[PDB]
Design a protein around this nucleic acid. Structure first.
Ligand SMILES: [Ca+2]
Length: 218
DNA sequence: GTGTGAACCACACAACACCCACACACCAG
DNA sequence: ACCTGGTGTGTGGGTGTTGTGTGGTGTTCAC
């Protein structure tokens, strides 16, 4: 209802906002926010215009600091860069799912047998004999896991957050099976082919709850 | 009396709608 | 205090749908 053309000025405005909030280039909200200054168009309509009609023209973006604020030079001027900052939601590389599954198995093996996988070597000081990891199978174990496990892990592999790593463990690793993934990962790695991350394991809903990513007129 | 010449239906494609698995989140029991 | 399940939220990378400014083009004050 009442379609409108994107003017030269409106397009230039969109590009400018994206250049000024580059961490948010693939969001939906940013384009919704631009619709405040661009009354004729919707969030959906602005985002599409950019993505399809304008991105091939971006050329540069403006550089931003650690604190997510635009960086300025000595005399107030903004810094042009052909470097895109990281997005808000980072994806899981197979190497990350393996690094997670191993650390969980390590923690578990130490929680269970009270032995150091690698050294092994008792954590208390009874004399087994316990399985020589990777001989161990997680098999139905799902905890307990300390918030400290996730905190130090996220400290070590900062690409993802503590909450990010936990939910990857809960919804992805526990769904696929800790042993199942480690075996799969190693199977591939041996066969000179790069393995793939865990996918499609999300099993969740809702009544109302409108479809996300639809910033329309109504 | 025979030619150039100054509004219905299609249709390409832009405007806009809508999609959904999951990354990252927070809280309660 | 601690783990852990239940669940909110909106990003990321799209695809699906509709409305519309410009083709045909048919006549037509006929000039
Ligand atoms: Ca803005």
């Amino acid at each position: 209802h009442n379609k409108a053309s994107f003017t030269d000025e409106e397009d230039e405005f969109i590009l400018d906002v994206v250049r000024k909030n580059p961490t948010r280039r693939t969001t939906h909200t940013l384009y919704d926010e631009i619709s405040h200054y661009v009354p004729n168009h919707t969030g959906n309509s602005i985002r599409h215009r950019f993505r399809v009609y304008l991105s091939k023209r971006l050329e540069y973006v403006y550089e931003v600091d650690k604190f997510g604020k635009l960086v300025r030079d000595d005399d107030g001027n903004l810094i042009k860069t052909k470097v895109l900052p990281p997005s808000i939601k980072r994806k899981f590389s197979a190497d990350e799912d393996y690094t997670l599954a191993i650390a969980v198995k390590k923690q578990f093996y130490r929680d269970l047998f009270q032995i150091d996988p690698d050294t092994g070597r008792s954590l208390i000081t009874v004399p087994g004999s316990e399985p020589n990891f990777a001989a161990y199978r997680t098999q139905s174990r799902r905890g307990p896991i300390a918030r400290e496990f996730f905190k130090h892990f996220a400290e070590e592999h900062a690409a993802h957050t503590e909450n990010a790593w936990r939910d990857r463990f809960r919804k992805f690793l526990l769904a696929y099976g800790i042993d199942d993934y480690i075996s799969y990962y190693e199977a591939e790695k041996a066969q000179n082919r790069e393995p793939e991350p865990m996918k499609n394991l999300t099993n969740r809903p809702r009544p109302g709850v409108p479809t996300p990513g639809n910033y329309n007129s109504a």
